[PDB]
Design a protein around this ligand. Sequence first.
Ligand SMILES: Nc1nc2c(ncn2[C@@H]2O[C@H](COP(=O)(O)OP(=O)(O)OP(=O)(O)O)[C@@H](O)[C@H]2O)c(=O)[nH]1
Ligand SMILES: Nc1ncnc2c1ncn2[C@@H]1O[C@H](COP(=O)(O)OP(=O)(O)OP(=O)(O)O)C[C@H]1O
Ligand SMILES: [Mg+2]
Ligand SMILES: [Zn+2]
Ligand SMILES: [Zn+2]
Ligand SMILES: [Zn+2]
Lengths: 34, 1105, 46, 50, 65, 50
Amino acid sequence: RCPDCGSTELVEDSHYSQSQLVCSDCGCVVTEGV
Amino acid sequence: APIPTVEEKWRLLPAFLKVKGLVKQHIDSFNYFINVEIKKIMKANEKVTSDADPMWYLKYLNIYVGLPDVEESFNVTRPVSPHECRLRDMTYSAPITVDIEYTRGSQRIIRNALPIGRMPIMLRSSNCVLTGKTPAEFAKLNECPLDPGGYFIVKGVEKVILIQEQLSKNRIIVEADRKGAVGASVTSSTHEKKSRTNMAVKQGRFYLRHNTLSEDIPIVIIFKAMGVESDQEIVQMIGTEEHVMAAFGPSLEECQKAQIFTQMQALKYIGNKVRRQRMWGGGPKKTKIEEARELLASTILTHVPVKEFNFRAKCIYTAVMVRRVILAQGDNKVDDRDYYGNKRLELAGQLLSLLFEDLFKKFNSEMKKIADQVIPKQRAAQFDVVKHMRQDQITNGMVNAISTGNWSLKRFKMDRQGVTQVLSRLSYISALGMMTRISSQFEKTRKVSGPRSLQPSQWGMLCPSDTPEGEACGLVKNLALMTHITTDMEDGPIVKLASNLGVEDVNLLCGEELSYPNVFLVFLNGNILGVIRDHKKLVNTFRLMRRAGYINEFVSISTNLTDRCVYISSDGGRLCRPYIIVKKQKPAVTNKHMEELAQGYRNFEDFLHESLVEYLDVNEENDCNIALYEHTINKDTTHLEIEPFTLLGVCAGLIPYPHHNQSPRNTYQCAMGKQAMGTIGYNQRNRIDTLMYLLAYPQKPMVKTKTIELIEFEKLPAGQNATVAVMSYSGYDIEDALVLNKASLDRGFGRCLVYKNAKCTLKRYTNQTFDKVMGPMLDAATRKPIWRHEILDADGICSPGEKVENKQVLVNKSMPTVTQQPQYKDVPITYKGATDSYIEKVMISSNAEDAFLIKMLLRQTRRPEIGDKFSSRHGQKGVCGLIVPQEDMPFCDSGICPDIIMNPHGFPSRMTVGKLIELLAGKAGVLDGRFHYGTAFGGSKVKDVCEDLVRHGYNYLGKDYVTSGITGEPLEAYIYFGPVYYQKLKHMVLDKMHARARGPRAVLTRQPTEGRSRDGGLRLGEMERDCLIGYGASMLLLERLMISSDAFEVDVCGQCGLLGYSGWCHYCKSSCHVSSLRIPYACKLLFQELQSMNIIPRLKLSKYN
Amino acid sequence: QPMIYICGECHTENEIKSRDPIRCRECGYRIMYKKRTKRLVVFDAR
Amino acid sequence: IAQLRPGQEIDLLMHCVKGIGKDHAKFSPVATASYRLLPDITLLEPVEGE
Amino acid sequence: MIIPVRCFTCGKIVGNKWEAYLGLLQAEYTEGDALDALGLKRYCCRRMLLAHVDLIEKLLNYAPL
Amino acid sequence: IVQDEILAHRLGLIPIHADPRLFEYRNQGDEEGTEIDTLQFRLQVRCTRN
RNA sequence: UGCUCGC
Ligand SMILES: Nc1nc2c(ncn2[C@@H]2O[C@H](COP(=O)(O)OP(=O)(O)OP(=O)(O)O)[C@@H](O)[C@H]2O)c(=O)[nH]1
Ligand SMILES: Nc1ncnc2c1ncn2[C@@H]1O[C@H](COP(=O)(O)OP(=O)(O)OP(=O)(O)O)C[C@H]1O
Ligand SMILES: [Mg+2]
Ligand SMILES: [Zn+2]
Ligand SMILES: [Zn+2]
Ligand SMILES: [Zn+2]
């Protein structure tokens, strides 16, 4: 779940060679860096 | 009265290319290996038997390699084309079978066809399916007719075995040591052992050093041990010159100091200096003198043979060596290693022969071990080798040695690397030039700068200009256009003719005759063949007999007057070059012979047989007189050069008018043409490689060399002719840059295609589960596949014809996690790419292991832009600095606007007059509809193209009246317009563009990864740190090397000075003195590694105040 | 669902399902390409 | 436009719109539109003979 | 691969004059007189037609068909 | 055998005899095209053995 | 790890 809005729309979207699991509703970066 | 000149003489070159030339070397070597050498290797190990249970044996009768086949079908073979092997990622090999006879239970059982291995078949060889085929049959097999071939196909990749270069064996080398002592060395190499024995003069006396002796011993003791005991005979053998005796005096005095005067005493002294090879198995039983005699007879000077413990030949050999050392100790006539007359070239044939011999010996040893282990204790069921003849041994050995490229022969103790290399498919010229490459034994790791020089011995044999620019400059070379590598001969008739020609036996006379001024020593492959008087008659008779045909045309004979030695070379690997024989100021080749050759009456073999053209070796041409042209022929001329432009190689042949340019320009042009973009072959569409570059509209050059016509480069061009105007425009072409026309690029100029391969495998594991591809995960909201799975077809595999974007799946691969219900996790093949790609084809194949191989060929159509590297076939590499519109381009009276504007300032510093000559010739040719020739040391002259220009109404110097497109006013100076053959290089700004966000880090050291494919970041090297220190920017250096790279926060205990975790010290079992601290992660790793090394760093922290 | 493929030498439309040995009728070739998609694709003349 | 073989097919639709040559060279209506100054050769002295 | 439609420098339509040029090669015309008869005055179109290699048929020989 | 992008590039260079004054510039976007500011050319060729 | 390259 997202820590800010509590939504479960956590998508793994790599933005310019940066792996990042981010919420799809409010855009809160859950996890980043691998 | 000028000497008549044969105009059609150059016609001798193509005929030579009909049977020999560029690619025939490796083909002939592989054919000789698979047809003759393999049978000899099998005969050498025809019988193998075990010591236990005698009267049992395994006898080989005859071995066959057969035609290439594939083991895909269940226990059935099938003919397979090389393109199919490329597609299926398998090897192109043929089953090595052999017929044998053995004894199972003392009853002879014979097998007529029993496979034992798989030999990878070289393309276009004798057994290859591609030979003897027509271009239509090549099209039926999906193979380019212009493909050079000669390369192996293993697991789908193309490997080429480079020609190895090494020093000649069994030759005395007189060289200076580190301390300046001029000593000698001889690496006697036989089929079994190679031993390098040296001789030094460290203390005015000659000591002989070998790896089998504990300490170097005086040479006089070895003389006394080898049969000759009288000192007078030794001195006579060394020489009768006063200075020779004066130099050898100390050795005689040192020998007389000891009590060594007989053969037994010397042998005992030698045996005292002999150390056992770490407790050799078996009772010695007083072998000291016997070991010494065996080392003298067999180990020392292996190439010099002793009939029956008769060291007369070995004594004469070491006496000649001592005499050479004495003579070299005066005038500094030190032999040089870079002299290519002492070089030997090993092709793929000899390497494959050694490898097959080693593998067969290992197989025989394994079979003997299995026999010894099975036969004496198993059962009354008689053991047979057929149940234990593993067929994967030789196959796996060959495959690994060809693919990995590292060769480890324990029987010969040879540990080589980089023998095989991946064939470069950048262009046809790239592969054609890489096929004729030659690596050096130096195996570059350091700055030798002694073989890297261009020696004059490379004349006619190796290309002087063609060399990789960089760290491999000078050690990686290319063969010339007209060259040949000799093979081994029988050496029988050579000895017979030498004995019949008056060569006195060395055993019949003492060594004093060796000191006579008129007596010349005759050698044979490093062995003393004998002595002779009036060596001119001997050399003339030997050359005439070789011309007649009774002696092989590749047997070389040379004379060294300084050492007075007649060398007769018949070993393989020597470089030879054809030359026209000149007798009494007139060449043997006339116009009538060339007319007959043109009409087809005769071939090059007829020229060889009729004593018209003969092969000369480097050592032989050292003594011969060669004339470049007919007008250069004088009274003292023995041979005539066929064609001077044959000096250059294949890559150098593309250079138009290379003699008008600078040598670094030619080298850079060869290096860039090896990377030139263009068509590969007629089967480039069905071909699927990991990276391919193609040109949209390739055009053949207007100024083409005869080498281009010979190599058929005009059928597969790698560039385009553009109307280049040499002028300065807008200041965007300051240093090597060029300005491109927007309208030209819009109409297809420079348009390129990049094909990439994406391969995936669905393999069956040990458990009965397989990788399966799921369908497109349709979105229930819209009843359509998601954006990621949009391009996938119904079977989960992307269909050709659509465009692929970044982070999109091509194959929806899911693999099981077990190896009760199977659990599949998704590992889809995502497409990493900055720009979009189009799928051209998807190939699905099935191997014998039920693994499905899927290959997608992605295509990208790219237009020239800012950053693309362009070449001009003259080493004038450039980058597109600006793309101006058509109206901004200057225009002539006819209305022609230039496509490429290049800077003139690049001409004076580089002196590329050849570029101007090529431009003028191309302009004349496009005006009169002709193709001018830029042949080296020839070609169309400037006067002819000037007349062609003045005839068509244009200026005789290329400079034309041009009006400026911007201001509309004429220019004060005329502009040099003309068509130039520009070639685009693979170096693109799109592939080289890189930008790094935070991104991933490495597990060991938390720093950005190395490469761009790994999404790495740029490294601040040591010199950058030095520059930042010199600038004094402490905060910038701290932010770069600590904050932005490997920043971390550790916990250090202020009591013990050790590293804690989560604000707690396990060492002191307390947390009051633990404090946080910023630190590079590499520094913490170093501290932990030092603590592991018992070097404990204790950190005493303190307040920042 | 009929999944169709094309042989490397016969060039005939062959329908094979999942987990089938890759082969083609009236021949023995084992190179099987996929047919071009039927979806509309837009290209730019630039 | 292209060359085909039996079995191959080319099916497409082409949408053409108005455009200027500055955007792309394919809109250029003129193949070669240029101008030159009119020459006027004059003889300083009367030249006769061969 | 195939003859380009537009000339790189000027832009004259040259793709339609390729096969006829081949006809002039099938006839007794040489290179220069054929290029003159085709109407190529400037040397850019002459270079375009003369230096072009017809690789489309060699590729169609390897086409699936 | 000709690539799709190369085919589109070759088709783009083909001139059209249409009068440009009777058409207008297509607005930004609007890939569907209208009667005023676009033209359609259908090219369907199926090669087969004689 | 190897090797071919790019300056
Ligand atoms: N023979 C061979 N050795 C390799 C290869 N890659 C790495 N090595 C060896 O591993 C060492 C370098 O390891 P790295 O390249 O850092 O391994 P890595 O890329 O971190 O491995 P991953 O974490 O799996 O990406 C070298 O000393 C090589 O001997 C390879 O492809 N072939
Ligand atoms: N091994 C290397 N180490 C450092 N810099 C290098 C190296 N190789 C190439 N470079 C870079 O390339 C530049 C070398 O070019 P330079 O030698 O001055 O001209 P060039 O290559 O001789 O060209 P010409 O042959 O004169 O046309 C300078 C350097 O920054
Ligand atoms: Mg540079
Ligand atoms: Zn502590
Ligand atoms: Zn078929
Ligand atoms: Zn033109």
